[PDB]
Design a protein around this nucleic acid. Structure first.
Length: 31
DNA sequence: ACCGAAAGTTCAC
DNA sequence: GTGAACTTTCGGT
């Protein structure tokens, strides 16, 4: 999507640290 | 069984 | 090569 489906998730970050910014449920920093 | 979240390659610059 | 990006797999309900 154009942004993570998670309301509280901004998308600028990651859990493991494989991305700096994303727009999916691929390791949402703030889920 | 279904679903939210964690997870690394990939096309584009 | 680096940079922003997603569906898959796993855990949870």
């Amino acid at each position: 999507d154009l942004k993570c489906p998670t309301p509280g998730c901004d998308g600028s970050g990651h859990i493991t640290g494989n991305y700096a910014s994303h727009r999916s449920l691929s390791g949402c920093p703030r889920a």
